[PDB]
Design a protein around this ligand. Sequence first.
Ligand code: FES
Ligand SMILES: [K+]
Ligand SMILES: [K+]
Ligand SMILES: [K+]
Ligand SMILES: [K+]
Ligand SMILES: [K+]
Ligand SMILES: [K+]
Ligand SMILES: [K+]
Ligand SMILES: [K+]
Ligand SMILES: [K+]
Ligand SMILES: [K+]
Ligand SMILES: [K+]
Ligand SMILES: [K+]
Ligand SMILES: [K+]
Ligand SMILES: [K+]
Ligand SMILES: [K+]
Ligand SMILES: [Mg+2]
Ligand SMILES: [Mg+2]
Ligand SMILES: [Mg+2]
Ligand SMILES: [Mg+2]
Ligand SMILES: [Mg+2]
Ligand SMILES: [Mg+2]
Ligand SMILES: [Mg+2]
Ligand SMILES: [Mg+2]
Ligand SMILES: [Mg+2]
Ligand SMILES: [Mg+2]
Ligand SMILES: [Mg+2]
Ligand SMILES: [Mg+2]
Ligand SMILES: [Mg+2]
Ligand SMILES: [Mg+2]
Ligand SMILES: [Mg+2]
Ligand SMILES: [Mg+2]
Ligand SMILES: [Mg+2]
Ligand SMILES: [Mg+2]
Ligand SMILES: [Mg+2]
Ligand SMILES: [Mg+2]
Ligand SMILES: [Mg+2]
Ligand SMILES: [Mg+2]
Ligand SMILES: [Mg+2]
Ligand SMILES: [Mg+2]
Ligand SMILES: [Mg+2]
Ligand SMILES: [Mg+2]
Ligand SMILES: [Mg+2]
Ligand SMILES: [Mg+2]
Ligand SMILES: [Mg+2]
Ligand SMILES: [Mg+2]
Ligand SMILES: [Mg+2]
Ligand SMILES: [Mg+2]
Ligand SMILES: [Mg+2]
Ligand SMILES: [Mg+2]
Ligand SMILES: [Mg+2]
Ligand SMILES: [Mg+2]
Ligand SMILES: [Mg+2]
Ligand SMILES: [Mg+2]
Ligand SMILES: [Mg+2]
Ligand SMILES: [Mg+2]
Ligand SMILES: [Mg+2]
Ligand SMILES: [Mg+2]
Ligand SMILES: [Mg+2]
Ligand SMILES: [Mg+2]
Ligand SMILES: [Mg+2]
Ligand SMILES: [Mg+2]
Ligand SMILES: [Mg+2]
Ligand SMILES: [Mg+2]
Ligand SMILES: [Mg+2]
Ligand SMILES: [Mg+2]
Ligand SMILES: [Mg+2]
Ligand SMILES: [Mg+2]
Lengths: 112, 108, 168, 71
Amino acid sequence: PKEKRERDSNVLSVIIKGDVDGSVEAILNIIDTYDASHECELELVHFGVGDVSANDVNLAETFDGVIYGFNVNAGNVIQQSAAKKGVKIKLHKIIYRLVEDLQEELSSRLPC
Amino acid sequence: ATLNQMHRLGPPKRPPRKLGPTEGRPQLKGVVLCTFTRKPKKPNSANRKCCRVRLSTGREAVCFIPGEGHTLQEHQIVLVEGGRTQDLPGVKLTVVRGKYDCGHVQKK
Amino acid sequence: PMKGRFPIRRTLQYLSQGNVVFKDSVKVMTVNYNTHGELGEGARKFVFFNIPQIQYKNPWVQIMMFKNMTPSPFLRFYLDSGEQVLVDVETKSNKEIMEHIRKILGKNEETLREEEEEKKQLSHPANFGPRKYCLRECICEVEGQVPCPSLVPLPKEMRGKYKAALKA
Amino acid sequence: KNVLKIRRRKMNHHKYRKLVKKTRFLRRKVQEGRLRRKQIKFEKDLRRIWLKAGLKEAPEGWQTPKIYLRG
RNA sequence: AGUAAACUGAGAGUAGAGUGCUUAGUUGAACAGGGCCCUGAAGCGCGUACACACCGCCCGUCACCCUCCUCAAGUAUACUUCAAAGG
RNA sequence: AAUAGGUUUGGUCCUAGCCUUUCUAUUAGCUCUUAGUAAGAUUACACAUGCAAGCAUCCCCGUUCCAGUGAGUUCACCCUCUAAAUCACCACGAUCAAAAGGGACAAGCAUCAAGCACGCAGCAAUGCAGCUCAAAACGCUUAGCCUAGCCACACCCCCACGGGAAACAGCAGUGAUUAACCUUUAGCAAUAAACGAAAGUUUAACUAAGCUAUACUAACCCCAGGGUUGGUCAAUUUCGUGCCAGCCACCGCGGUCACACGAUUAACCCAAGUCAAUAGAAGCCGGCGUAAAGAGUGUUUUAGAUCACCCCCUCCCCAAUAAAGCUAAAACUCACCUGAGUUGUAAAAAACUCCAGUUGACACAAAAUAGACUACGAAAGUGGCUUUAACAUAUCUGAACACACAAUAGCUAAGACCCAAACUGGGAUUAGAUACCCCACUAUGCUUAGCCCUAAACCUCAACAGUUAAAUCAACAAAACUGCUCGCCAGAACACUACGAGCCACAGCUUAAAACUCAAAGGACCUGGCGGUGCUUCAUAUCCCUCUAGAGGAGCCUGUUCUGUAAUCGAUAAACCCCGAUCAACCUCACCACCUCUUGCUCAGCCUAUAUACCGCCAUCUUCAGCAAACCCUGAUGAAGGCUACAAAGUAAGCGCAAGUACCCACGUAAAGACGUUAGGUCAAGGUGUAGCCC
Ligand code: FES
Ligand SMILES: [K+]
Ligand SMILES: [K+]
Ligand SMILES: [K+]
Ligand SMILES: [K+]
Ligand SMILES: [K+]
Ligand SMILES: [K+]
Ligand SMILES: [K+]
Ligand SMILES: [K+]
Ligand SMILES: [K+]
Ligand SMILES: [K+]
Ligand SMILES: [K+]
Ligand SMILES: [K+]
Ligand SMILES: [K+]
Ligand SMILES: [K+]
Ligand SMILES: [K+]
Ligand SMILES: [Mg+2]
Ligand SMILES: [Mg+2]
Ligand SMILES: [Mg+2]
Ligand SMILES: [Mg+2]
Ligand SMILES: [Mg+2]
Ligand SMILES: [Mg+2]
Ligand SMILES: [Mg+2]
Ligand SMILES: [Mg+2]
Ligand SMILES: [Mg+2]
Ligand SMILES: [Mg+2]
Ligand SMILES: [Mg+2]
Ligand SMILES: [Mg+2]
Ligand SMILES: [Mg+2]
Ligand SMILES: [Mg+2]
Ligand SMILES: [Mg+2]
Ligand SMILES: [Mg+2]
Ligand SMILES: [Mg+2]
Ligand SMILES: [Mg+2]
Ligand SMILES: [Mg+2]
Ligand SMILES: [Mg+2]
Ligand SMILES: [Mg+2]
Ligand SMILES: [Mg+2]
Ligand SMILES: [Mg+2]
Ligand SMILES: [Mg+2]
Ligand SMILES: [Mg+2]
Ligand SMILES: [Mg+2]
Ligand SMILES: [Mg+2]
Ligand SMILES: [Mg+2]
Ligand SMILES: [Mg+2]
Ligand SMILES: [Mg+2]
Ligand SMILES: [Mg+2]
Ligand SMILES: [Mg+2]
Ligand SMILES: [Mg+2]
Ligand SMILES: [Mg+2]
Ligand SMILES: [Mg+2]
Ligand SMILES: [Mg+2]
Ligand SMILES: [Mg+2]
Ligand SMILES: [Mg+2]
Ligand SMILES: [Mg+2]
Ligand SMILES: [Mg+2]
Ligand SMILES: [Mg+2]
Ligand SMILES: [Mg+2]
Ligand SMILES: [Mg+2]
Ligand SMILES: [Mg+2]
Ligand SMILES: [Mg+2]
Ligand SMILES: [Mg+2]
Ligand SMILES: [Mg+2]
Ligand SMILES: [Mg+2]
Ligand SMILES: [Mg+2]
Ligand SMILES: [Mg+2]
Ligand SMILES: [Mg+2]
Ligand SMILES: [Mg+2]
């Protein structure tokens, strides 16, 4: 079997970046309440505190993940790099908004 | 060659040395993509634990994991050094045990 | 082994054995010699053995050679004033040509000794600096003077770490 | 001497000649495209000359010839 | 060559058990001359990519897998150059 | 690369790459006591905050310096001329140093070979058409440099009016980023700088401190760790694991007795370090018949050489080349007369019978003998006859930047056509036969005119001059070298490839890399084996043709394999198969089921594993005659080899053969039959090493 195997469509890889460490732990505890792994799997590639960085874009491009920013900013250089690499930066400011958007991406992965 | 030819050719020009898998660097940071085993070339037989990792430069490469037993997984961070695996054709990188997410081998 | 006949000619030791150092007037030396003929033998050996030494001691003097252009070999020197010195070399050995041109256009042993001494004034022994330029780098190398702290720690009283501590 | 080095070259040349025969129609389409770009690259080289000299058009009566066509 | 062929007896071993084995004897042949074609031996060579040795070695086509490279339609992006000029 | 070492093979020699040992730096792992000193972001990415230039009776002066960085990159050095500045003021000069002029000045790529105005003259007008370049122009890429220091840059647009935009490459600090990560200390006391007439003032320059094993020096009553221990290369005990887990710089290790893995013990090296990765340091005077390499051929320029001069012995002639003409032998075709067959080969078929044989007529094809000659030509090539024209150079080397040539095959056009002949068709063969064999026939070979530009174009041995002197000389081949020049070569493979460029070439040619991969490839040998290998002589129940009786078919007897059974084992090509067994109804017995015993017939036992640990006893070549100690000699003292009797380097104890002995001879048959080969048979004759079992 091919040493490198194809990630299935129903797999959401997410990068979580937050303004403060306590905010990140809150989002990570919400990602630990995921119970629908059968229909779709949620993978946490990397989590950290601070603005979106090139490593986050490189990690998202490596695993075809989605960067979720919580009360953080992404500069034009980082945003332009994401366009070339196809990464989706999803900056939010409210935790119920960032979870609703997280559920919308999971729904898309689900089978029709 | 004649003295006239040696003068005309000049001093011998060394080729620029070939950068190995680390691109002339002692170590590189990498992210583990997948783990697997690769069989050694004849006459050796074994299941040598290897992994594919994207380096900080953006080049995916196969890296050998030394020691008895490892727990590397996808998305993890590892530091890779040079040193080819003699019996694994094409394996020119080695994971450093005890750095980042790759821990030291557990004794016995 | 070194390629060619008389490879000694291609050594720094041989090239430094030239005794002909031209006066500043000498700007160009043309050598007209013949490849064959018993009377042009010294000029051929002069070109073969000594032209390399002359050029080595006189790097800024143009030396140009001309083969079989005239019936006899001769040297001609062009001076900065515009004067030309014709030296007939037919029948003369290579050693006689070198001794001839040394007498009429070479610096004497006295003029060379002086130049060497003026060069010694450039490296004064009492000066301190890098080994490339000076004998000693620091006065600490002189016996009797306070040595470098890298080798002999200075007394606590001569160190600012403790001068301020007591004062403060 | 043995002919083992000759034999290595023999097989390489055999396989190469056979490959070319198998792909002679693709290679012909590729070669044509390269000659077109080669002609365009040549025309650009000449246009650079008159444009860098201050002229706005090619010298009067000048037509850049096709120097790469089989004709 | 007292060979083959045919015939007869005995022994070993068993409590008994062989169309087997070991062994003694009787009768008693045919061919043995050509050949180097076939398969080998010896002598003297030749060749050799074989050397646990021809049951040796070995080339190419046709998968999976892994590594690198090239060509390439259309398209996009980035970089480079301009004034080193003219009115 | 050195005082070198390891690694190609069955072995030797040569060549060759790779690696080892030495010395630094960075980074990682693990570990770390003190003092002194030195050094100290990965990044020209973005920067919070604080500070870093003031001085001074107002003017000026300074903030154009110091400090920083290494993006770009021959503005750095020498000469000429000559501003600004210092010597209060002119110095009628020195010192220092711009601009300008001249010269010099990095690396890689020539697959960057042409640049495209790059020159000159003239007072001007204007005229001429030149200028640089294979001795590397132009171009692309890389990099701060020649370190008392210098150059360049100062957020970007080379510049900085203007614009983008709001600037730490000043100190401290921070985000991002990288394998890489110093304190948001103090003082102007010293030195340096700025300012002042000066006392003085200011200065993140600098000084004295802070942090950090990166280095050096020194020390310590207590306090040592890292790596290594198969060879290279200093140094391992007991266990575990069993080609697994793992290790490895190189060669390699591990598949049930691991000095190589893991643990443990001990030892070795270095030591507050250790040494895993990475990087640098250490590489042109060697070669080119066969290892990479004399570019298919000859001829220049600028140059280089001393082989030029004197001074010379084979000029000339044999198969150079071009053109025109010519034909002896053999074919083809046709005609007459005969024949019924011809052709084909190990043997056939198919094919042809307008076929075959005799005779005559008879070519745009090809050139027996000579040639045992060795000539001509630059090479490629050139060997039938005649004629014509005709075979460069009164020094040598020399063009892959040019010119002219270049077997065969091939392309285009027009002709010839005997024979041969890719392809193709048929016949045969074969498991198949897209081959080898047979037949037919085309492209093509020929002429003319253009192309194409390739050969194992190799005598794989460059041109010219010279030597046989020696230190002859790795091996082989075709002895070893000297001078000089040009060409070419630098592990294997990728690769007579890709890309670029050129070309009447278009499935082409020439030039010609890289990435990934390997630790070899390679050249020449030694010995043996093997050969559908040569010659010679043979086989003596024997290789063939022969001779006699059998087996293979039938039934039975017996062994084996398969199948079957709850129900052994071993042998199992020659060299198993009425074999271990000169022997199984119980027993034998080792198997199967059930039941029973546990210090047991034994100071226990085991027919448990391993014949690939062995002794013992044997098979096999052997229906052989060779093995081997100790010496000697040869090969330049390599693996290896060692015979000539009119003898030339072999001498050889011992073992086997032989000789003897047994049986009825001196014959025959037995017996004997070495060293080795098949890890051949046998742990189930017995014994026994190692591992396993002990209710
Ligand atoms: S060098 Fe002289 S005091 Fe340090
Ligand atoms: K092995
Ligand atoms: K070597
Ligand atoms: K002032
Ligand atoms: K730089
Ligand atoms: K700039
Ligand atoms: K001060
Ligand atoms: K070792
Ligand atoms: K060739
Ligand atoms: K003839
Ligand atoms: K040849
Ligand atoms: K042999
Ligand atoms: K039978
Ligand atoms: K045995
Ligand atoms: K036994
Ligand atoms: K045993
Ligand atoms: Mg290693
Ligand atoms: Mg041969
Ligand atoms: Mg090949
Ligand atoms: Mg075979
Ligand atoms: Mg070899
Ligand atoms: Mg400075
Ligand atoms: Mg840089
Ligand atoms: Mg002045
Ligand atoms: Mg200047
Ligand atoms: Mg190219
Ligand atoms: Mg740079
Ligand atoms: Mg900046
Ligand atoms: Mg600027
Ligand atoms: Mg700073
Ligand atoms: Mg930081
Ligand atoms: Mg550091
Ligand atoms: Mg003052
Ligand atoms: Mg201060
Ligand atoms: Mg300090
Ligand atoms: Mg360390
Ligand atoms: Mg063990
Ligand atoms: Mg071990
Ligand atoms: Mg060769
Ligand atoms: Mg030649
Ligand atoms: Mg027939
Ligand atoms: Mg010539
Ligand atoms: Mg040539
Ligand atoms: Mg030709
Ligand atoms: Mg032709
Ligand atoms: Mg025919
Ligand atoms: Mg056929
Ligand atoms: Mg024809
Ligand atoms: Mg003809
Ligand atoms: Mg030839
Ligand atoms: Mg050649
Ligand atoms: Mg030549
Ligand atoms: Mg070819
Ligand atoms: Mg080609
Ligand atoms: Mg091409
Ligand atoms: Mg028989
Ligand atoms: Mg039967
Ligand atoms: Mg049986
Ligand atoms: Mg068996
Ligand atoms: Mg057996
Ligand atoms: Mg019983
Ligand atoms: Mg029984
Ligand atoms: Mg038993
Ligand atoms: Mg055995
Ligand atoms: Mg006898
Ligand atoms: Mg016998
Ligand atoms: Mg005997
Ligand atoms: Mg066996």
